[PDB]
Design a protein around this ligand. Sequence first.
Ligand code: SF4
Ligand code: SF4
Lengths: 170, 166
Amino acid sequence: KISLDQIDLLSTKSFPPCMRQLHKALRENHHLRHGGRMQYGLFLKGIGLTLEQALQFWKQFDKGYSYNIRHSFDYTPFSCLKIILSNPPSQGDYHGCPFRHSDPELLKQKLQSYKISPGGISQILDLVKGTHYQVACQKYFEMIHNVDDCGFSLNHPNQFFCESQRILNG
Amino acid sequence: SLDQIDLLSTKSFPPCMRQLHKALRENHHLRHGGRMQYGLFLKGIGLTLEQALQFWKQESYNIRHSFRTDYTPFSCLKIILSNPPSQGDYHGCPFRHSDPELLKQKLQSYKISPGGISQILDLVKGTHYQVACQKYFEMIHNVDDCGFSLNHPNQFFCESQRILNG
Ligand code: SF4
Ligand code: SF4
């Protein structure tokens, strides 16, 4: 067992926006609805981690849940197209793809909170207007890693993670 | 404690780290080059290799979840191009540093098919060490194309974990 706050830095450095938002929502709300638990949990599964949900003894608003991580040593982790094209999030949901599912003004605010430069935000929003969600995410990747070219064709959040970790490990 | 990742090593470690895990299990020790290569690889997956000491004794390897020094894991080119292993050293890259006959025997013990071993040895003879390792990856995971360009052992591990948990 491992605390869920241990991967805060990893989430900011290597998670794609779809999983970064879900980690943040889990940390702040102490719970995710089923759509988020599936998207984020299966993403963690693809890295070799087991998300675990627990109910606290004092639960008879705070729903009384506690989430943690455990290192793993038959649900398939979601691809980009599955996240973008299926299961659009309702108002209680934090899952989905921010480039496809966030209102553009809210998306701009979100990218600003991520410290993306104004030019990068402009390029990303341009790509979003063309419905090129994964290309916009490749742009996000390039901005957050300070590289000119991501060097791969993005089609999976876990692929995003592996390529980010490759860059970070030299 | 280290025996827990034997299976993990057979399924997800690249040959360079699989050989170091085997050597640690069998010799109960690694020299500094091997400890660095393997330990930094393990740190990158979230594990801390350490030796146990009794605190009450006045002046055995295990692993623990990681939870002061540069922990950056070695890349393929750093392993391949520097620190060639001496006898007694188990570090390095098997595609670059193992005699081809020993590499073929090792791949046989890894249950690679004869045709796959032939492909790998052809690539090694051309000095395409990372491409040979990509081919190894494709064989042990039964996939047509690995779908990535390999230049880091921890990247090998990450893509393997994607497939095994896919
Ligand atoms: S493009 Fe793919 S990886 Fe990027 S945020 Fe959208 S679903 Fe996630
Ligand atoms: S090519 Fe890289 S990952 Fe593969 S065995 Fe050699 S050093 Fe390890």
